[PDB]
């Protein structure tokens, strides 16, 4: 029932190596559905999941226009940040924005997001009350004063409570059979010697959607979090995900260890073990 829509904007200056670049990508949960790249030949908002492709020409026209205007805006923002931070016009810098809405099972806004980073560090964020700002440094305090005067929070609140939630609901219906059907992980345990006296037990989770998953090892029923190697959840390339978790076990003790999995596609938490 609970779902999210997020946009991720990246703007990069690169004096002498290219024009200032603006990229936007949009996601419903863990599924990318649109992209815009100012480096493209003739930039437009483009579909990246099939369930968005039947939106009409006015959808693509207006979201392209917003992105073209954003390209100009963020080029200016990079210049403004140079002034705030007393930086050289020859250097390369990055401005990022993430924003969007989380909806609960009732279709109501649960949480809104709107935050910015400059050169990889927090710059300014809209607080969870959707009415005040957290500025990270003295430069962002200038932006905060300007955005208070421009009533930016009130406009964001209107967008989050209206357009964002309404279009997220529409996308979830457009793509119901992929976005609202959890694909459970396919799970198995493998065994790989690290020496003549210890081996890795690796618990695999493959082919799952959405990407949130918990994967842990227990020994004799006790959590082994401190000894478990956990790789970052990674895309399989087909809009499903993969993860594994590994523990190093003494040879002959493999039966003490159990792997534990929770995922939205599993109606009960799952326990598995190594079997030769």
């Amino acid at each position: 029932g609970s779902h999210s829509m997020r946009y991720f904007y990246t703007s990069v200056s690169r004096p002498g190596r290219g024009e200032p670049r603006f990229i936007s990508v949009g996601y419903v949960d863990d599924t990318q559905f649109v992209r815009f790249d100012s480096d493209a030949a003739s930039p437009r908002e483009e579909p990246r999941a099939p369930w968005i492709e039947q939106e009409g020409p006015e959808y693509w026209d207006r979201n392209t226009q917003i992105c073209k205007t954003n390209t100009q805006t963020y080029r200016e923002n990079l210049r403004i940040a140079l002034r705030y931070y007393n930086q050289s016009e020859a250097g390369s810098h990055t401005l990022q924005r993430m924003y969007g809405c989380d909806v609960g099972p009732d279709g109501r806004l649960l949480r809104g997001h709107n935050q910015f980073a400059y050169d990889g560090k927090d710059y300014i964020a809209l607080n969870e009350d959707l009415s005040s700002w957290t500025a990270a440094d003295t430069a962002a305090q200038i932006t905060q004063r300007k955005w208070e005067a421009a009533r930016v929070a009130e406009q964001l609140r209107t967008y989050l409570e209206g357009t964002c939630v309404e279009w997220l609901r529409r996308y979830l219906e457009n793509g119901k059979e992929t976005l609202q059907r959890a694909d459970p992980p396919k799970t198995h345990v493998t065994h790989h010697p690290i020496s003549d006296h210890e081996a890795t037990l690796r618990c695999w989770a493959l082919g799952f959607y959405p990407a949130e998953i918990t994967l842990t090892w227990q020994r004799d029923g006790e959590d082994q979090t401190q000894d478990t190697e956990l790789v970052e959840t990674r895309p399989a390339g087909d809009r499903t995900f993969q993860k594994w978790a590994a523990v190093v076990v003494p040879s002959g003790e493999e039966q003490r260890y159990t792997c534990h999995v929770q995922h939205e596609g599993l109606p009960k938490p799952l326990t598995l073990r190594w079997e030769p």
Partner: peptide, 9 residues
């Protein structure tokens, strides 16, 4: 659907 805003620092 994008927010129709052009916010400057």
């Amino acid at each position: 659907y994008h927010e129709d805003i052009h916010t400057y620092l």
